[PDB]
Design a protein around this ligand. Structure first.
Ligand SMILES: Nc1ncnc2c1ncn2[C@@H]1O[C@H](COP(=O)(O)OP(=O)(O)O)[C@@H](O)[C@H]1O
Ligand SMILES: Nc1ncnc2c1ncn2[C@@H]1O[C@H](COP(=O)(O)OP(=O)(O)O)[C@@H](O)[C@H]1O
Lengths: 303, 305
């Protein structure tokens, strides 16, 4: 007994990329592969479009019925999963693909790491080894942004987090202006809030989105992707003397891998097990990845 | 600003929706309580609004399953109804059950009360929780989630445990049957809440993960208090006379004494529950029906889509 439709890869294979798709997918096709974009994310994007389009139709039928002239608000798709599981990559692929459909061409990504407390604030509270954990986020700010978007507010400012500087970038904002679809990606989007008091009003990030995807893989597999991501930066980004992690460039490859493994085991893996995984089954759609990133199983809530 | 469309009564009436003899028949016992006016003006169009959501989900199911190449049938659309003790959610669910069933895309409508998933008095007593009936720790949550999970898995003939307000207890060996209807109306105090984290690592799903839409019925605490006190007084004059009623000893109290008792229970039990466990989750609802003291709906909030 299961509340999910279940597909292996062949079953998912029961639509074609245009020059336009390839262009919007630039730099991401190399990472994800033409095969995988074609066989998985393109159909995924079509499936998600059925949902977005259904919601648009409902909005129009109900607002006509209710005699409200108010315009639609965005359909928000949540992308959750461990650090390094591929949330950002998936969000970029889907942003490019979802935008090919004429009923929802305007598609934006919001990452929740923009709502991390700054290092200075984390450092003061002794939370620097807890980035990504619930207590490391400005939740009121996140909920305020999601509330704004779902209230139809124009030109909502999104704060920005630089992985390069490992910190919030003061005075830097992306603008999300009532697009058709928001892809909200983050570690923490399926979690609930901290109850300061019993009587404090409680809403969750999920109360502001319509559909969630969880990207799953085995912990040992994600570890390797994480170490490899760190290593890739070690060979490129971290050479910048202004990079937060420039000091890793003085370490040998083996030493960066060990340090990567250490950060994985004491920070991101604990976060995964304590704060991310437990909320996996709140997702409407679970993408299960093999070690090579290929999607080998999709779960989709029955409707 | 606001994630809700807002309607006063005039605006709600600015929505051909005429009660039929069949509606009238299905509403028997409820029409006398809620009144023809209120049913016609609020609940009928409310049911039509909800019909849009259910039939949309049905259409989505048909289109996506065609595209996904899946032959599995739909599962039920589940509408949550939450609110304080005595705010009128049982009344609301029965009215909506009758009205929602009039549409041929979803004539099969069932109501699940969360009361049925309360622990028995004997279990509550052992754990000292008889003063906490309706609080989260008083419910068999794994049992409720198993039932919702089963419904949302397409399972046939799901057995729902039954609570008697008369006996103030679960009725042993008694089950209602929910059998893949088109709509399940899920009513109870706790449907917008979250589970307790026994451990951090424990898998977490909420009741809300098994429903599609939720209504919260709201009113001033002082107002609900009065509805509560009247409801108990009403039973004191009728149902509690039965020597096998749980609260039969209340018949020995004066009309004023039982009122004082009812006021006490509200103040120390139900109102604390409202303030601590129900009202904090009000804003999770898609639709909030706001009642005036006479029960008439004076404001409707509906999440913007
Ligand atoms: N579908 C994929 N195919 C191949 N590599 C991928 C895929 N998704 C992610 N990656 C790689 O895995 C690592 C983690 O991806 P990322 O999207 O940065 O994860 P997250 O955003 O969850 O932290 C990156 O090095 C990325 O290049
Ligand atoms: N719409 C309404 N109009 C008039 N009376 C109502 C209405 N809704 C509920 N009531 C009355 O208020 C009291 C509480 O209703 P009930 O549905 O039993 O509350 P709940 O199920 O939330 O405990 C009952 O005495 C009921 O008759």
């Amino acid at each position: 007994i299961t509340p999910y439709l279940q597909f292996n890869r062949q079953q998912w294979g029961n639509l074609t990329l245009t020059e336009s798709d390839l262009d919007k997918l630039q730099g991401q096709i190399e990472i994800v592969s033409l095969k995988e974009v074609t066989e998985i994310y393109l159909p995924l994007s079509r499936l998600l479009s059925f949902y977005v389009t259904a919601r648009q139709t409902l909005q129009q039928a109900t607002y006509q019925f209710l005699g409200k002239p108010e315009p639609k608000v965005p359909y928000i798709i949540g992308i959750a999963g461990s650090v390094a599981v591929g949330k950002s990559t998936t969000s970029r692929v889907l942003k490019a693909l979802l935008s090919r459909w004429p009923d929802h061409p305007n598609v934006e990504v919001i990452t929740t790491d923009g709502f991390l407390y700054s290092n200075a604030k984390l450092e003061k509270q002794g939370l620097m080894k807890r980035k990504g954990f619930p207590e490391s986020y400005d939740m009121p700010s996140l909920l305020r942004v999601l509330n704004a978007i779902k209230s139809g507010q124009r030109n909502v400012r999104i704060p920005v987090y630089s992985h390069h500087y490992y910190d919030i970038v003061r005075g830097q904002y992306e603008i999300v202006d009532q697009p058709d679809i928001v892809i909200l990606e983050g570690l923490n989007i399926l979690q609930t809030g901290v109850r300061k008091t019993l009587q404090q009003l409680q809403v969750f990030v999920s109360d502001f989105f319509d559909f969630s995807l969880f990207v799953d893989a085995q912990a040992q597999v994600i570890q390797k992707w994480y170490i490899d991501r760190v290593l890739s930066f070690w060979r490129t980004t971290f050479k910048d003397p202004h990079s937060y992690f420039h000091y890793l460039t003085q370490m040998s490859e083996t030493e960066v891998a060990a340090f990567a493994k250490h950060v994985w085991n004491e920070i991101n893996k604990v976060n995964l097990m304590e704060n991310i995984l437990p909320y996996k089954n709140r997702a409407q759609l679970i993408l299960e990845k093999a070690a090579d990133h290929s999607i080998q199983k999709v779960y989709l809530r029955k409707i």
